[PDB]
Amino acid sequence: HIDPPVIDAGAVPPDETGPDQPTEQRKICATPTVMPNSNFADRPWANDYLRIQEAQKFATGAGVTVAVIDTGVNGSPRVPAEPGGDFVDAAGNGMSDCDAHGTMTAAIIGGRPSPTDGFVGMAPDVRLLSLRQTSVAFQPKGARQDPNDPNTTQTAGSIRSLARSVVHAANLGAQVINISEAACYKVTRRIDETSLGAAINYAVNVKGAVIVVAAGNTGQDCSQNPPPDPSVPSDPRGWREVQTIVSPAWYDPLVLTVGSIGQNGQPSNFSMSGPWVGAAAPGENLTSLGYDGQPVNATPGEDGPVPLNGTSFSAAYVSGLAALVKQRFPDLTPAQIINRITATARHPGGGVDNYVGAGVIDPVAALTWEIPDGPEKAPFRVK
């Protein structure tokens, strides 16, 4: 059985770039593409759903710096990312995207507008820092390293490198940090992630950064969590039912963990549920910008182009919103910014659930409603 994580505040990892262990490229670099008969002159559905243009009357993210911890970005005029370091390739600086992912995450956050298409990011004036922290294209040069030690898995290595990248992003002055990584593991194969909990506490409570993270997508090691047992009112979020830990998703409420919804507003079937999910955002059939800063809405797959889907894109919308909120209310702490966002989130029935948390974000409301400032800091368990 699983209980919420306890943070060892003294275990902050050193602020160093580079992979948990030496790596090499094994895959050819991927490149995003375009579905047949796409008309990019129209607004992407997510822009209409979230009323991005209406929200932009109230803020644009000017003066705010967002760190994109993802697969790197190939920068362009419309996605003017800056190097935040590379935690996959020792030779890199974060300005190379071999996965066709990080670039689109960054464009959703702060992609600039164009007279020739209807795409614009949520916060088109932010400064963007790219930290490449994952990639399917790289592997460790050395082999495992004792295949029954759960701390020598790649999942565990990614957790340790994520920790350094959070410290690094905060020390670079990111006020909003978007994390696409969702490391999944079982109760019985527990990873030592004290370095990560410590990094997060440092970035949020010492450096004042908002951290927004993907809920995670179902797949190989991420198998869906079952729903809470309603007959146990003392465990309303169903910690006792959890089978899969998702990290850093489970550091709620220090971080804001974001699930995905589809075009009709439904919670996405690939979105990882858990007692830690705090909000949701568009995460299916998305449009973003490619390596040249032009619109893309697909990545190639085995039997054709595949639509842009994923909770990392959902988190990106929320990171964009946090940048808007940060510009408009510059004195708010991270907890207070997150509070504005969750207080204006909504879903039928209401309350908080394991799929959309407080619900789908509402940018205009986050920016304009009268919402009493919450406490400056979120409570958490410490050793």
From Swiss-Prot:
Region annotation (Disordered) ranges: 138-157, 218-237
Location, primary (coarse class): membrane
SUPFAM superfamilies: Subtilisin-like (SSF52743)
Record's keyword terms, sorted: Cell membrane, Disulfide bond, Hydrolase, Membrane, Protease, Serine protease, Signal, Transmembrane, Transmembrane helix
Disulfide bridge positions per record: C29-C98, C184-C222
Assigned EC number: 3.4.21.-
Short name of any one Pfam family annotated for the protein: Peptidase_S8
Cited PANTHER family: NEUROENDOCRINE CONVERTASE 1, PROPROTEIN CONVERTASE SUBTILISIN/KEXIN-RELATED
Family: Belongs to the peptidase S8 family.
Identification of the protein by name: Mycosin-1
Organism: Mycolicibacterium smegmatis (strain ATCC 700084 / mc(2)155) (Mycobacterium smegmatis)
Gene, per the UniProt record: mycP1
